[PDB]
Amino acid sequence: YGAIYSVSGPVVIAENMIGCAMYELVKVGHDNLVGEVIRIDGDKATIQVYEETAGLTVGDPVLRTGKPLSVELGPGLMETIYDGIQRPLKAIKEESQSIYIPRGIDTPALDRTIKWQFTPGKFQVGDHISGGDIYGSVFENSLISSHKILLPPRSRGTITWIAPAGEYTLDEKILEVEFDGKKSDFTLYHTWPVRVPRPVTEKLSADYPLLTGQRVLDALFPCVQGGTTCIPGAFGCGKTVISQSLSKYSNSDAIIYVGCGERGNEMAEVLMEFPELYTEMSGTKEPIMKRTTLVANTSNMPVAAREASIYTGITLAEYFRDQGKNVSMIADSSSRWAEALREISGRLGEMPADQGFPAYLGAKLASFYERAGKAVALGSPDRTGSVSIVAAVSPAGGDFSDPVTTATLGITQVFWGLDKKLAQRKHFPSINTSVSYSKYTNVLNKFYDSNYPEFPVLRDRMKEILSNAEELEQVVQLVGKSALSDSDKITLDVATLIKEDFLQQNGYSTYDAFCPIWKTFDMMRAFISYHDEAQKAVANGANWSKLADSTGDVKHAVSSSKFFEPSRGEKEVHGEFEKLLSTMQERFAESTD
Template sequence: MAGAMDRAKRDGKRAGENDKESQYGSVFSVSGPVVVGENMAGAAMYELVRVGHDELVGEIIRINGDKVTIQVYEETSGMQIGDPVLRTGKPLSVELGPGLLSNIYDGIQRPLRNIAEKSGSIYIPRGISTQALDREHEWDFKPLDSLKVGDHISGGDIFGSVFENSLIDDHKIMLGPRAMGTITHIADKGSYTVEDVVLETEFEGKKTEHTMMQIWPVRAPRPTDEKLETTNPLLTGQRVLDTLFPCVQGGTTAIPGAFGCGKTVISQAVSKFSNSDIIVYVGCFAKDTAVLMADGTEKPIQDVAIEDEVMGKDGCGRVVVGLPRGVETMYDVAAIGQHHNQAENGLLNFTCNASHKLVVCTPQHVRLTDHMLGQKMQTSVSYFVMGQERVSADRVISAVTLRMRSWQHELHGGHRAARVKAEAFKASIDKDEIFNWTIEAQHVAALNMHVRKATQQTISPVLHENHRFGDILSQHGLDPQLDARVAYLVGLWLGSGSSDEPALTIASNDAKTVERIDSLCSALGLVASVSDEHHRAKIARVQENVAHSAATADDQKLHRDLHIKIVADGGETSHNVFWTTLSENGFRGASAKEPKAVPSWVASEPFGVREAFVAGMVDSAGQVKASKDRAMRRNVDILTGHASVCDGLVRVARSLGIRVSASMQAVNAYAVFLSGGEVIQSMLSLCAVECNRAARPEGPVKRPGQSFNFTVTKTDQAPYYGITLADDTDHKFLLGNLALVHNCGERGNEMAEVLMEFPELTIEREGKEHPIMSRSTIIANTSNMPVAAREASIYTGITISEYFRDQGKNVSMMADSTSRWAEALREISGRLAEMPADSGYPAYLSAKLASFYERAGRAKCLGSPDRDGTVSIIGAVSPPGGDFSDPVTSATLGIVQVFWGLDKKLAQRKHFPSVNWNVSYSKYIRALQPWYEREESDFINYRSKAKEILQKEDELAEIVQLVGKSALGESEKVTLDVARLLKDDFLQQNGMSKYDRYCPFYKSTGMLRNFITYYDAAQKAVESGEMSWSKVREATDHEWHQLTQMKFEDPNGSGAQAEMEKKYKQLTDSITEKFRTLNE
């Protein structure tokens, strides 16, 4: 023993140079995770100890004289009698503060990601010690304005807040529950670590320093002011749970079921869709970044509000559900121009934070080469694959990488044979493949040189269509179908019109244009007055991809111009729809410097209107490069003297899917270059000038997104403004410059695949399934930790949950599974030689479970300001073979208030959620009654009737098996068929579909109302005896079909609730009217 003590003392880093010898004991015996230590006089129950030379984490669970029994949470193999045992004098505790939600912990709150970085291994080395909260990260602390030096403060009082992430944008900093005193110092607003002192108090002459971090023992519940009655439901989005067996926020639920019954699926649904205070994805940009809203307008990102809708690449809105703010190192993302004198107006620039995910695409690039390697000739094929790229010493990301496969000539039969093999391999690679992926801005510089060169960002066409031109015409009593004609005239005016009057200048030889103008004016009730103007040189021909413009001798010949003034039929410009359109809708600039402009709303007009607008500019100020075959790809150059027109034209062209760039030809002279295939041809088909016009493509025009090369430059720290989109979207939206961007900020969960599949969301986006991080902090036990470690993890999880509850949050904790936790108790109990109870479990199993579940509930939080929070516990139970008489299941059911019993037979029939409606129950119906009466006054009656139908159907099933359905009465036949309808089209839910993976409560109640309305009316119809059920069923076949289609209504999107409630109400009325007609 003396040798062991000496070794421990010499190991200063492990044991600590200041530890006294009296703090040490020694190992007396070892039995798996149970270690007995001696010479431990003065030790306390549940004291944290370090066992052995590796200082394994353990906890004292029994004291007998100077001997103690220690439960060790790490593998004890190799431990010997006499090894040191170090007392810490502290209980097993967790660190609580900012940074909790960005980590994945093991059962004793060691951050697994940090361990992987520190050890360089996917396994956890024995005895490794890491701090739960990052000590170096600085948080932006904001003290509470109402507190000042001299104020009294007590336990639980909030004295400041920090922005943590999108999940908690106001992480409240609270005084520890056991502290109190008078404030002698409070930190100013600024950046601090969790260890920096931000508050100092004095109590009875003793000063105490407080940081943003709290230490709390896991086995002690955090105190509250008082327990409150639960009043709000924990909505899961699963109809069978929310309507028949609801839980409350702050309630306790058990989910027992055999393997394969879908416990994890329900956990995933609760994790993603429950009404707890958790959000996952964030997008962050610099101030004044223009965002394209769902209605086609632009708004600075700092002005976007929650519940606003931004535009997605499919033209549909994306609801904003969060607006995080903060300060971070920023990155400038800029398009690489195609011209030496690239005009800034045409660039796609924006500034984002470091973790912003750029939406990029990388075309496949395959190259075959012969080269020398190690003095040996080889033939190699290089190509791109989606793989892993190390961006720093401690970070690996998913990215496109360069791969190379080589055939050494000497080993493969010479140069020709090696090349044949290489050619065959090259042919097997899909050369048309395009990798669509995302990468954080801060990691772009770490990409392979060839990958970086090939990687581009995307401009998305605007698929949303408004009708503002048509609305303008309607206001003047004109046909809105003439919108494309007005747009063409506006394009002509922007290209060659007078800024202070409704007049155009065109070449005299453009007879077709004159005819077109005259025809358009006639349709609009206008008159085109033509007169000669001055002579001028033709527009200089713009050369694409050069820094200057040049004109040929022919170009310099003078040509006579026509001055065309467009006036109202009576000659009064005040009633001129053309001039009103220009003057009142943003086409006339705000200053003399910029007398013309293209408003942003033009880019969201119907495609035909946008094309007519651009065609007008081509006819008045553009050139189309001649081509022998007009069906071939065409290029268009447009000159303008106004930067605002250049900028707007670029935007409109991009919205059509046209590849576009711009350059500055001279001071106040800009050139816009358009190129493309059928998108250009479709636009040119609307031109009036013969040499510009092209044949319109056959069939619908495809408008693919356009890619562009870009640079990423690191800049200084600056404020960022975020947009958080709902989980059921693709998390992509359009900026004002039509660049497609992705939410960012959450780095994802690299350790999830290593640890366990919890919880992954099977959401398909762009042909791929994307797993998404759970909205809860993950406490996971790895496979190489002993089973005893599970016993601590459940207390770690509930303590963290209580910490967030104390901030006024609604927290859901899912324990998967409590059966494994009970097995840990059984193993420890067996090694302690305790008297076993049923199935070998300890006699105190029920008491242990009760002490865990009783920490759930709704509570008035300690301290001020007044707030209340909830902790809901959902415990999955895995009884062997699905036997609900298992001791763990039986003990759990005696404690929890909600029982979601899973049925193996339902799961085998692919009926999910496989909740058995005959054995499941909820004891919260009375507590929720006031809430139900506010939402749907008749809901309780609908629920009771549905349960009654299902129960009767179960009783009738045995009779049907014996004598057949034909022996039943008409009323029983109605019950059987409606029960089948309820089971197949209400209780069953497709978690893989967009329309049914989440069912809001209003949809559930609307569906249930119609089912019960039909059932009651059908029973009344057959009770009269005048009609059989088969005739009633035949006469109401349409309504029956409508009942089966209700679940296919999609609750996603703006206005979905009002539209769905209207449809369901119409179906209710239709059912009532149909049966009234039958009864008559």
């Protein structure tokens, strides 16, 4: 198409633009380097090269790819590791035997050797089709199929060619659409741009909770599925432990991991730790790696994968939410994407902004958090889906007043802090009562209380004991150890056992990863009834050590109740709490006398 006019630095200038848009990606020269036209000034177009420009001279042709810079969505995304630019990591590990993509890569974004069985849907010949309807289904998992074959956006017409059932590849076509003549060819996989979100029928308010398995996380401030959550990272404070524990202990059908500016060790530890550990949903043949999607880009790769990693993860999470499954988007971190966008903005020659970041970082960060959420499926088939955006926010430039952490903290309505002492203390997450907050706890308590919750009464009482013990610790330190009363020792003793039983979790057994809502609901009622019975027993005349020694195995069994199996009452309710309430009521009379 165009001719190379000049090459200065990492950016390339090409003239002879006769229709090349500023959103389409193409390869400059004969090396097939990754690049995209960022701007255009007259006949000469400005394209940013994210790869090595060695061996490029003036007078070379520029071949366009024929579409915008996006990623391919189809079968085979699970159980594979790729970059943000849709680069095959398993193909580079098979051919080159390395984890870094070389310069001049032009392979496809999906594997073509793994064939899948395509089954036809309820659509027949003669009926009109449209984007959003389920045209078929293809297996993508190791045991079952979860990738629903739907119509892509910007397409409609009649089904002129109906492919039958059988095994086919991604390159071979199985469907054809007829609209105004020869519109285009359809296959198993489809292309979609990463700069445009997936359209749906309508958006709804998120009221469903994320099945993770944290007793203190679900009990104190339960983050619902489909809300924006921000967490401050420290690069070693517990950010990778929450993603690794949330990926393995989580029982969701879909999972998307987005690595924008990681060092490389966390992507290899999370990638190698996935097939070794099993899941809680009874999966087999790599259930952790098959139900999760790996998108890991290091800090030494090009900025196109780091900047397009959030758009590829948001597009794959939008396609997974449009397919009807719930996917959790865990990203780390936004500071590497903001620094990668600021490096391309400063290298391209654009005007700078406050704090050295670009002016579009606030609109891209607001559009990235606003793109996720719970919504219905597009087209006529309405399905239930949710997209939880949990992105970490590390420091950039050695400051705390930048608009990245302040804009992400002010834009989000849920917060989960992480401390360096809490990660060393075996606490996950490292926030007890002052490091986390949530505004959607009213709807989450209305839905979880809508199923069969008793957490709505003990929700404020659970945080009230920790706030009373934390407020009493400063009065005990500054005022004196003998200034506290007997009720403060029972409240701090109940908050220590509730924080040690609920917040104290490091995956010691198989019951500390997956936690039901019934055990967390009865666990707060057992500690609330033990604190109320301890305060009422101490109010009638008794000692603190005489009351704790009078309790004994009743209070000691509540701390060791997490070690027991979760199938105590039917399959999820703890039966030790129901008899422990009457046992604590019978022990309350012996504790007073």
